């Protein structure tokens, strides 16, 4: 309940609506799976932030319905030649001409990185934590230092807000 209020109070309403929709399409109640709700919001926000700090360098795939995501991915592949992924990535980088998978973890960045790399094949991976750590494919961080730094500050602030409201301990030990 406190976690549900936190989410509504600290994410802009478009992120909340997107996260909510996603969950109840797949039979998940955001009032029950409150840690999941908050993680979905958090990840979505990072994806939007990462896109925004780009002229139009990044195409946003996360946050669309699957029809549109797959329409976007299909369209990108036919006009670039880049191999088509098996899972929907998060962004396309039109400068580096590669898909990006964004991860946001409350565990060690190397652990989650492995877990994503294993789950994927030419998709660039960029992991962020709530501690100001990141790990990215070939240590290529894609973004400039200021953009990365704004993302990390936002993540650390979510963490501390949660901790203000005694939600961090639950959120940290849970898993999306
Ligand atoms: C489903 C899912 O879970 C965690 C992520 O970081 C994702 O990007 C993702 C997805 O939409 O593919
Ligand atoms: Mn995604
Ligand atoms: Mn992701």
Curated annotation (Swiss-Prot):
Annotated binding of Mn(2+) 2, by residue: 62, 90
Binding, Mn(2+) 1: 43, 62, 90, 101-102
Record PTM text: Phosphorylated on serines and threonines by host kinases, including human casein kinase II.
Positions occupied by motif Nuclear localization signal 1 (NLS1): 106-120
Documented effect of changing residue 25 to K: Reduced affinity for Baloxavir and Baloxavir marboxil
GO MF terms held by the record: endonuclease activity; metal ion binding; RNA binding
Function: Plays an essential role in viral RNA transcription and replication by forming the heterotrimeric polymerase complex together with PB1 and PB2 subunits. The complex transcribes viral mRNAs by using a unique mechanism called cap-snatching. It consists in the hijacking and cleavage of host capped pre-mRNAs. These short capped RNAs are then used as primers for viral mRNAs. The PB2 subunit is responsible for the binding of the 5' cap of cellular pre-mRNAs which are subsequently cleaved after 10-13 nucleotides by the PA subunit that carries the endonuclease activity.
SUBUNIT field: Influenza RNA polymerase is composed of three subunits: PB1, PB2 and PA. Interacts (via C-terminus) with PB1 (via N-terminus).
Family classification: Belongs to the influenza viruses PA family.
Name this polypeptide is given: Polymerase acidic protein
Organism: Influenza A virus (strain swl A/California/04/2009 H1N1)
Gene, per the UniProt record: PA
Shown residues within the full chain: 1 to 196 of 716
